[PDB]
Design a protein around this ligand. Structure first.
Ligand SMILES: *[C@@H]1O[C@H](CO[C@H]2O[C@@H](C)[C@@H](O)[C@@H](O)[C@@H]2O)[C@@H](O[C@@H]2O[C@H](CO)[C@@H](O[C@@H]3O[C@H](CO[C@H]4O[C@H](CO)[C@@H](O)[C@H](O)[C@@H]4O)[C@@H](O)[C@H](O[C@H]4O[C@H](CO)[C@@H](O)[C@H](O)[C@@H]4O)[C@@H]3O)[C@H](O)[C@H]2NC(C)=O)[C@H](O)[C@H]1NC(C)=O
Ligand SMILES: *[C@@H]1O[C@H](CO)[C@@H](O[C@@H]2O[C@H](CO)[C@@H](O[C@@H]3O[C@H](CO[C@H]4O[C@H](CO)[C@@H](O)[C@H](O)[C@@H]4O)[C@@H](O)[C@H](O)[C@@H]3O)[C@H](O)[C@H]2NC(C)=O)[C@H](O)[C@H]1NC(C)=O
Ligand SMILES: *[C@@H]1O[C@H](CO[C@H]2O[C@@H](C)[C@@H](O)[C@@H](O)[C@@H]2O)[C@@H](O[C@@H]2O[C@H](CO)[C@@H](O[C@@H]3O[C@H](CO)[C@@H](O)[C@H](O)[C@@H]3O)[C@H](O)[C@H]2NC(C)=O)[C@H](O)[C@H]1NC(C)=O
Ligand SMILES: CCCCCCCC/C=C\CCCCCCCC(=O)O
Ligand SMILES: CCCCCCCC/C=C\CCCCCCCC(=O)O
Ligand SMILES: CCCCCCCC/C=C\CCCCCCCC(=O)O
Ligand SMILES: CCCCCCCC/C=C\CCCCCCCC(=O)O
Ligand SMILES: CCCCCCCC/C=C\CCCCCCCC(=O)O
Ligand SMILES: CCCCCCCC/C=C\CCCCCCCC(=O)O
Ligand SMILES: [Cl-]
Lengths: 34, 562
């Protein structure tokens, strides 16, 4: 559509990716503690 | 596509599989191996004493390098190798986390483009709010033309409110769908109200007479109704098939049932644009100059003095002024018509003044008639427009035998000065001249022009003052109407192709570059253009409008009185 639509879509995927990586780094700390 | 919740579910399943595997091993113990155990991410197998154990990076972890392996070591006794200094099991995860040091580089692009969005839409909303308030405050600015502008202003204002709602719920599911639906509706009303601006301007020019109230009612249904139609069809086709993402409109063919109606308005605007520019001249006549009130004495006195300067007696005077060419301005048609009339007895009552330059053979032909007949004057030198105005206000008829004439500004100049036009029924002369304000003839026909000149001579035997007055009112009311339309077209003819060409170019440019040099320059420019669209419309229809500026200067002068 228009450029403002694709920005919201890339932002949505970027925030979900950020949330997922933060969860993975938290598990990696649990592995480190184990 | 992969959510944090989805990874949690996949990790829970992997943990349950590890618990079952360990129970199957404990029921049949043998030897001294390292036992399986769950370390919160993956399940380790049986370990042989003194051997390194490698496990491929788990599939259920989306962000891992799935071509690498995690590592452990098993003691000679049969215990997993520990971390030195602590009672923790040691492991090597460097390969799985290899390409997982991304940190943030995309933040720079998303923050810049998002700032351009908020800045551009804020300036657009602020400029549109003061624009709609000015048009509603001053009572002198209340007309159908400004009512259409206020509808166009409101559509861009609601579009700005929609994106502020979209990024608000983004900063924090069905609430997102209604947000993008309202945005696509307002986006469609913007392009359809631009088509309304083109239809209104095209109607003022090509419709001699219509009802503005009824047209405004049809424009409201066109601008707000039709976008709601194919957007509702869009929501109907969308929600039924599945329940995909909120902002991935471009992925499926569902986007074409909304882009096509928007494209249809752009094609309609290109049609209206071509019709208007072929008929509406870029600049009118100098109204401050072409006025008979600049002349002194009566028209009879001015014509007698004029013909005396050329060395002729009084008579019905016909004038031609224009380029001497073969198939355009039509001086060849006039010269042939003068030869046809030269054998008539009525020729002695006529006077001819031919002014122009161009083809040498037509210049010699004109000079030949001037030398052959004592009632024909030819001027090939350059004349000031003061002397041309003297001729328009002294002669009886002006002959305009053009083969084509899109605007006919020469007719309007002569008619404003009382000269009755005899012109070809082509182009603008056809729309300007009627039976009560001139004589029209078929183009390229010397006989029809000769007969029209004969009818003009018989007409001159009676008083022509009333005929001259009708020609003045016609030229004055035609140029007044044209100058009013030109002010509206000064901005409408700019916004129609600007929005249309940008939309088509941006639609034909794909998202293939994926944050490359091409991608960042397209995303930066399209965000700048789309965000300041309301600011562009506010300037074109209010801040640059001559009536609006004159009203704020009137208010500022009353507030600044020494
Ligand atoms: C270091 O820390 C360990 C704790 O576990 C960790 O390991 C480190 C490396 C990291 O990975 C940490 O994240 C992780 O948490 C300590 O391990 C623990 O060690 C003790 C002592 O060896 C274990 O206790 C024993 O468990 C045996 C297995 O139990 C089961 O099987 C028996 C079979 O008879 C059943 O009865 C039970 O119901 C269970 O199903 C068990 O055989 C041992 O038996 C004895 O004691 C009981 C009474 O308590 C008695 O009745 C019996 O006759 C035996 O005499 C004992 O119970 C413990 O399970 C183990 N825990 C884990 C999670 O591994 C490690 O010792 C420590 N090392 C040092 C030196 O600091
Ligand atoms: C594989 O198996 C081998 C044979 O069992 C292991 O060797 C044995 O290791 C144990 C201890 O893990 C030794 O046990 C006794 O150890 C204590 C240690 O003292 C403690 O106090 C300090 C703090 O002051 C603390 O840090 C320690 O954790 C202990 O709590 C000594 O005080 C005793 O004298 C006694 O030695 C055995 O001596 C040792 N030898 C045997 C039994 O052959 C070996 O570590 C295992 N690992 C590998 C990879 O080989
Ligand atoms: C934690 O593990 C990683 C990954 O390890 C290797 O482990 C060995 C046992 C074996 O399975 C091997 O196939 C694995 O790759 C260690 O990182 C890497 O270290 C190896 C050397 O052992 C590097 O190999 C290379 O070899 C070529 C040819 O000789 C050289 O040209 C290269 O320079 C390099 O030496 C490999 O590239 C390393 N991998 C990465 C991702 O860096 C890591 O050292 C280890 N750490 C600890 C503390 O154990
Ligand atoms: C987006 C703006 C659309 C037009 C705004 C007006 C909405 C309806 C309110 C009043 C309409 C009736 C009066 C029409 C003349 C306005 C001048 C006046 O009466 O003060
Ligand atoms: C009352 C006449 C003027 C009304 C101006 C706003 C018209 C809005 C509309 O007709 O949609
Ligand atoms: C739809 C309502 C009005 C559209 C009228 C279009 C008139 C211009 C047509 C020019 C042409 O196609 O030749
Ligand atoms: C990325 C897109 C780059 C191309 C943008 C092209 C913009 C074209 C828009 C307007 C150009 C034509 C304007 C014509 C105005 C005519 C005014 C008049 O005739 O009175
Ligand atoms: C990419 C940049 C696009 C700029 C779009 C500008 C829109 C406005 C353009 C024309 C509207 C009329 C402008 C009149 C300028 C003179 C103002 C005046 O003196 O009255
Ligand atoms: C305090 C604001 C002025 C109102 C008080 C009355 C005095 C008005 C006389 C002069 C003040 C305005 C001066 C404006 C200069 C305009 C120059 C320009 O328009 O180019
Ligand atoms: Cl006509």
């Amino acid at each position: 559509x228009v450029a403002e639509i694709q920005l919201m879509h890339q932002r949505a995927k970027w925030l979900n990716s950020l949330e997922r990586v933060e969860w993975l780094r938290k598990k990696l700390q649990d592995v480190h503690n184990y | 596509v992969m959510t944090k919740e989805e990874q949690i579910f996949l990790l829970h399943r992997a943990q349950a599989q590890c618990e079952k595997r360990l129970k199957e091993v404990l029921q049949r113990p043998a030897g001294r191996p390292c036992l399986p155990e769950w370390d919160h991410i993956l399940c380790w197998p049986l370990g042989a004493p003194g051997e390194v154990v490698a496990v491929p990076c788990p599939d259920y972890i989306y962000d891992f390098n799935h071509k690498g392996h995690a590592y452990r070591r098993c003691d000679r006794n049969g215990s997993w190798e520990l971390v030195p200094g602590h009672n923790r099991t040691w492991a090597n995860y460097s390969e799985c986390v290899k390409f997982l040091t991304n940190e943030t580089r995309e933040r720079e692009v998303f923050d810049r483009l998002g700032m351009i969005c908020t800045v551009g839409y804020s300036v657009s909303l602020a400029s549109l709010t003061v624009a709609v308030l000015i048009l509603a405050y001053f009572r002198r600015l209340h007309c159908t033309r400004n009512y259409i502008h206020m509808h166009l202003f409101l559509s861009f204002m609601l579009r700005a409110v929609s994106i502020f709602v979209m990024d608000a719920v983004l900063y924090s599911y069905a609430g997102c769908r209604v947000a993008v639906t309202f945005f696509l509706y307002f986006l469609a009303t913007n392009y359809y109200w631009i088509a309304v601006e083109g239809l209104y301007l095209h109607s003022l020019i090509f419709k001699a007479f219509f009802s503005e109230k009824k047209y405004l009612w049809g424009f409201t249904v066109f601008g707000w109704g039709l976008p709601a139609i194919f957007v509702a069809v869009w929501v109907s086709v969308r929600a039924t098939l599945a329940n995909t993402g909120c902002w991935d409109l471009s992925s499926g063919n569902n986007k074409w049932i909304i882009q096509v109606p928007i494209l249809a308005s752009i094609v309609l605007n290109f049609i209206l644009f071509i019709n208007i520019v072929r008929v509406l001249a870029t600049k009118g006549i100098d109204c401050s100059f072409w006025n008979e009130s600049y002349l002194t004495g009566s028209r009879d006195e001015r014509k007698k003095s004029l013909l005396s300067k050329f060395g002729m007696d009084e008579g019905v005077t016909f004038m031609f002024i224009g380029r001497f060419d073969r198939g355009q301005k039509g001086v060849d048609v006039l010269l042939k018509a003068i030869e046809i009339l030269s054998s008539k007895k009525e020729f002695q009552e006529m006077r001819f003044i031919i002014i122009g330059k161009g083809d040498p053979e037509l210049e010699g032909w004109a000079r030949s008639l001037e030398e052959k007949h004592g009632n024909v004057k030819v001027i090939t030198e350059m004349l000031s427009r003061e002397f041309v105005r003297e001729l328009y206000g002294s002669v009886d008829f002006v002959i305009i035998p053009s083969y084509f004439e899109p605007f006919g500004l020469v007719a309007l100049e002569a008619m404003c000065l009382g000269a009755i036009p005899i012109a070809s029924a082509v182009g603008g002369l056809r729309d300007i001249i009627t039976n009560e304000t001139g004589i029209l003839v078929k183009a390229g026909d010397p006989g029809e022009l000769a007969n029209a000149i004969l009818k003009a001579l018989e007409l001159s035997r009676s008083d022509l003052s009333k005929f001259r007055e009708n020609c003045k009112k016609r030229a004055m009311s035609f140029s007044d109407t044209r100058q009013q339309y030109r002010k509206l077209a000064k901005s409408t003819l700019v916004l129609m192709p600007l929005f249309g060409v940008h939309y088509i170019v941006f639609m034909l440019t794909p998202y293939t570059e994926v944050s490359g040099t091409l991608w960042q320059v397209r995303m930066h420019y399209e965000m700048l253009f789309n965000s300041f669209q309301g600011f562009f419309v506010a300037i074109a229809y209010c801040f640059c409008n001559g009536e609006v500026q004159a009203e704020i200067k009137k208010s500022w002068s009353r507030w600044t009185l020494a």
